[PDB]
Design a protein around this ligand. Structure first.
Ligand SMILES: *[C@@H]1O[C@H](CO)[C@@H](O)[C@H](O)[C@H]1NC(C)=O
Ligand SMILES: *[C@@H]1O[C@H](CO)[C@@H](O)[C@H](O)[C@H]1NC(C)=O
Lengths: 48, 50
């Protein structure tokens, strides 16, 4: 089971992690049943 | 989940994921009913010493 917990926060701090507390609600539980040891973030380019 | 009690209306703001509730003893104190998704409080039936 892949448990994904999520929390969305309106902030106005410029550079770093804001200092505070916010408990993450559970978003989804996925019955994937696979071995995971490595992960990748996916980004988007901007072209002009 | 089996048990005995009176099912009453409640004012506990359950979050969407949250289904049931537990007391210190871990006995269930509130439950979310299937089919209708409402939140029913479970209050033990009246008892006491004679
Ligand atoms: C999962 O992958 C890692 C690295 O490839 C390996 O060491 C581990 O034994 C694997 N686990 C299972 C259950 O296959
Ligand atoms: C059946 O239960 C689901 C919850 O799993 C609910 O969304 C749906 O409205 C229920 N339908 C009826 C006819 O009770």
């Amino acid at each position: 089971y892949f448990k994904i917990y999520s929390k969305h926060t309106p902030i106005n701090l410029v550079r770093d992690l804001p200092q505070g507390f916010s408990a993450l609600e559970p978003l989804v539980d996925l019955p994937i049943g696979i071995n995971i040891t490595r992960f990748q973030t996916l980004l988007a380019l901007h072209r002009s | 989940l089996t048990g005995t009690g009176v099912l009453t209306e409640s004012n506990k703001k359950f979050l969407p994921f949250q289904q049931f509730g537990r007391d210190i003893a871990d006995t269930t104190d509130a439950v979310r009913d299937p089919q209708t998704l409402e939140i029913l409080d479970i209050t033990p039936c009246s008892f006491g010493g004679v």
